[PDB]
């Protein structure tokens, strides 16, 4: 008999209900045909809408028109152009909803309308999937919230018996709208990736737990449990526990986004949402595939005292092993070059004793030298000269345990490299060099020339009263002198700076 809560809400807001009222108020004018019925605006149509459903400003209506065609693309009722995909389409819709706040009710109404009296069940379900992905991001207005929920509840009651799967999908939408207001630290910034989409689908279909693949430095992997709101800090904690890193060491670890084809290894902020990162990777124009890699991020102990404070490094033997493995890998990638040929030959000698514990049985070859010296160092002399220099250092090497050789290797690298234990961020400067490295470690903040690896500036944590961030800068307050660096990595920089300075 009486109109639904949604229809009552739409009566004073929808174009179709308003135009019919202005035809009822000033009824003196002659009508051409019967009134088309204002409720038809709530029903599916194969054609793209020519104006927004809700009466609003023409600037907002124009964006609502483009949004409608995108909803149609997501639902498979409008084709997707050459350089686009379904994940990219829904990311656009949610982005429009995030930044155009007054377009939110209109997004929810367009999605819902397209689920009501749709001739294809494989289009209406996608319409409800979109409602789910909107409900995890932003709330509809306080005015629309209850009437819209009551409508979903009615559609659930009407389809419970015939379609219990589609009913579970509507029930999750209702759960996610009931969850609002979402706390600030949990508010998602991106729409879903094709990964998040598939995980959501197979969890409703099969009930199986969603996981994310995380690599370690040894190239081994771990599957971490992932939810809508999982942060990078939470996944780092879980994979590290799975690997066997002790409770106290877990805080020293972090995650980097690694792309091998396009040489990128970028720190991932511990406060980012893992699903927001996955969406950002889809949006990247970089060639190749990205993957997450656990790395030891923080180094609080003095590398110069490692041989006399072994327990600080070896008590957690899993953490020690991952640490040794990480420094060895950086050495093999040529990251440590503040080393002369004698120092490199000593390093090569230790690393050979670690690969071949039987000192007497050693036959030194070109192939053995390549396992322990990076090309960057090897380039400086003929490999035959390296064999001879390494053979000489091996004569000065006494029998040692594998653990002690790993500590000796770290001590040598650590003592000779000013970048050891630093987290590096690419920064832009008007000073020389224009493209520099912001280095943050246990001592403070530095600026390093990437070419020479020479430190241009250094500020201890004691000498910095406060820090500040903008969307494109990092600022340190150092007597009042402000030092500013161009970078968009405020989130990762704040986490690294807070950790080290707070000690």
UniProtKB/Swiss-Prot annotation:
Domain FERM per the UniProt entry, residue ranges: 210-503
Compartment annotation: Cytoplasm
Residue ranges occupied by any MyTH4 domain in the UniProt entry: 44-201
Entry domain remark: The coiled-coil and the proline-rich region are responsible to the binding to talA.
Family: Belongs to the TRAFAC class myosin-kinesin ATPase superfamily. Myosin family.
Purpose of the protein: Myosins are actin-based motor molecules with ATPase activity. Involved in the early steps of phagocytosis and adhesion.
Quaternary context: Monomer. Interacts with talA.
Name listed for the protein in its UniProt record: Myosin-I heavy chain
Organism listed in the record: Dictyostelium discoideum (Social amoeba)
Lineage: Eukaryota, Amoebozoa, Evosea, Eumycetozoa, Dictyostelia
Residues of the whole record sequence present: 1851 to 2357 of 2357
């Amino acid at each position: 008999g009486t109109d639904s809560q949604l229809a009552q809400w739409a009566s004073t807001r929808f174009r179709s209900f308003k135009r019919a009222s202005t035809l009822n108020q000033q009824q003196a004018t002659l009508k051409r045909k019967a009134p088309v019925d204002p409720n038809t605006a709530f029903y599916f149509n194969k054609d793209p809408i020519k104006e927004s459903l809700i009466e609003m400003e023409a600037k907002l209506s124009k964006k609502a028109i483009k949004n409608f065609s995108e909803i149609m693309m997501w639902m498979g009722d409008y084709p997707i152009p050459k350089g686009q995909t379904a994940s990219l389409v829904i990311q656009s819709i949610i982005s429009r909803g995030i930044e155009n706040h007054e377009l939110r009710d209109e997004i929810y109404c367009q999605a819902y309308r397209q689920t009501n009296k749709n001739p294809k069940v494989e289009s209406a379900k996608k319409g409800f999937e979109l409602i789910y992905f909107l409900s995890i991001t932003f709330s509809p207005s306080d005015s629309l919230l209850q009437p819209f929920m009551e409508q979903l509840m009615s559609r659930n009651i009407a389809i419970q018996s015939s379609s219990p799967q589609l009913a579970s999908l509507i029930a999750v939408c209702i759960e996610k709208l009931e969850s609002h207001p979402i706390p600030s630290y949990q508010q998602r910034k991106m729409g879903p990736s094709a990964t998040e989409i598939q995980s959501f689908r197979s969890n409703l279909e099969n009930g199986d737990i969603s996981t994310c693949k995380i690599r370690f430095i040894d190239q081994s992997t771990k599957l971490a449990k992932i939810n809508t709101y999982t942060t990078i800090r939470e996944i780092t904690d879980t994979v590290c526990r799975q690997y066997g890193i002790s409770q106290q060491s877990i805080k020293m670890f972090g995650i980097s986004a690694v792309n091998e084809t396009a040489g990128i290894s970028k720190v991932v902020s511990e406060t980012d949402m893992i699903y927001d990162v996955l969406a950002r990777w889809e949006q990247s124009e970089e060639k190749g595939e990205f993957y997450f890699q656990v790395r030891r991020r923080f180094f609080l102990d003095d590398v110069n005292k490692i041989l006399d404070q072994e327990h600080l490094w070896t008590d957690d033997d899993i953490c020690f092993e991952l640490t040794y493995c990480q420094i060895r890998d950086e050495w093999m990638k040529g990251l440590y070059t503040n080393v002369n040929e004698k120092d490199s030959s000593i390093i090569a000698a230790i690393l050979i004793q670690l690969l071949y514990p039987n000192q007497s049985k050693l036959v030194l070859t070109k192939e053995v030298v390549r396992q322990v010296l990076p090309d960057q160092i090897l380039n400086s002399q003929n490999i035959k000269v390296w064999i001879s220099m390494i053979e000489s250092q091996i004569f000065e090497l006494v029998s040692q345990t594998p653990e002690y050789l790993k500590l000796m290797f770290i001590n040598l690298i650590g003592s000779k490299s000013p970048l050891f234990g630093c987290t590096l961020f690419n920064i832009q400067q008007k000073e020389n060099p224009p493209k520099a490295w912001l280095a943050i470690n246990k001592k403070g903040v530095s600026i390093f020339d990437p070419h020479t690896k020479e430190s241009k500036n250094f500020w201890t944590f004691q000498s910095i009263s406060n820090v500040a961030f903008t969307d494109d800068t990092f600022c340190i307050m150092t007597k009042p002198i402000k030092q500013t660096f161009t970078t968009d990595e405020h989130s990762s920089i704040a986490s690294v700076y807070q950790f080290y300075s707070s000690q």
